[PDB]
Amino acid sequence: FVNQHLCGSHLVEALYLVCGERGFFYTDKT
Amino acid sequence: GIVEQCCTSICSLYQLENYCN
């Protein structure tokens, strides 16, 4: 599951940057 | 969701802004 794991690490950083003060949720069951 | 949308092909910051609260 490591490719997805690494991708997610970068998605959260990018979400952090664009969302700013809005913040964001990162979750889900699938 | 976001992994299937953005781990299979590149999402720009404009696309990722969709997921902000």
Ligand SMILES: Cc1cccc(O)c1
């Ligand atoms: C910025 C970023 C990280 C990971 C996947 C993406 O599609 C985009």
Ligand SMILES: [Cl-]
């Ligand atoms: Cl990586």
Ligand SMILES: [Zn+2]
């Ligand atoms: Zn990395």
